[PDB]
């Protein structure tokens, strides 16, 4: 393609995308953390088996 003189390219971040992608990432993180809490539940139940 052509070039511009006296104009520049805006970095391709519409901040909204990454902000809501942050809430989503925090979401998956928290869900997986809850699953780890369930892992501890299971394993301490194994502790309780004794």
């Amino acid at each position: 393609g052509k070039l511009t003189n006296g104009a520049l390219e805006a970095s391709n971040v519409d901040l909204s995308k990454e902000l809501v992608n942050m809430i989503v990432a925090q979401r998956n993180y928290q869900s997986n953390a809850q699953t780890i809490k369930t892992q501890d539940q299971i394993l301490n139940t194994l502790v309780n088996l004794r």
Binding site: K2, A7, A10, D14, L15
Partner: protein, 50 residues
């Protein structure tokens, strides 16, 4: 972002036009001075956005 860029670049154009009209109307009576007009145009609109 791009919406604010739109807001501002139009502000730039409006300021330039005001400057031009003030320039002319002030210079109005000088012998040898010709009326002058300021023109607008669109950016290097090129596509990667879908």
């Amino acid at each position: 972002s791009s919406l604010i860029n739109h807001a501002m670049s139009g502000l730039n154009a409006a300021q330039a036009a005001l400057n031009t009209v003030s320039n002319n109307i002030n210079n109005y009576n000088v012998a040898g001075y010709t009326r002058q007009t300021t023109i607008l145009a669109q950016a290097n609109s090129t596509l990667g956005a879908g």
